[PDB]
Amino acid sequence: KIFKPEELRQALMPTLEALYRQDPESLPFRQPVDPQLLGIPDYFDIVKNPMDLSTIKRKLDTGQYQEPWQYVDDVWLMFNNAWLYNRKTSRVYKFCSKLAEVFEQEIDPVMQS
């Protein structure tokens, strides 16, 4: 499959928008994790490949995703990072799990079409 980056933007962006609409659950994911602001100086040791919603949006706007799985891989990276770093009892871990449930529902049909 050859992929049109504006046709992929139009197909994929509503799945990203689905994640942004979740409030409060998307709030920690809207900008890059800032370890200084959050007081978590080991974050970049543990999380080698950070990702967040703003980064995925800018990637999709600059035509960075040659094919849709690369996009799906970034969304999962963002989730896996938050699950790796955070305790299971934490607000952000539980928000991650909600976002992942939303994403799975949204992306399923879109990757079909």
Chain positions contacting ligand 2LL, by CB under 6 A = 27-29, 31, 33, 37-38, 40, 82, 85-86, 92
Nearest Cα neighbor of 108 from 60, 75, 62, 66 is: 75
Indicate the residue among 27 and 62 with the shorter CB distance to ligand 2LL.
27
CB of 76 to ligand 2LL, least distance (A): 14
| 34 vs 67 by CB, closer to ligand 2LL | 34
Minimum CB–partner distance for residue 56 and ligand 2LL (Å): 13
Q: Which of 78, 62, 52 is nearest to 9 (CA)?
A: 62
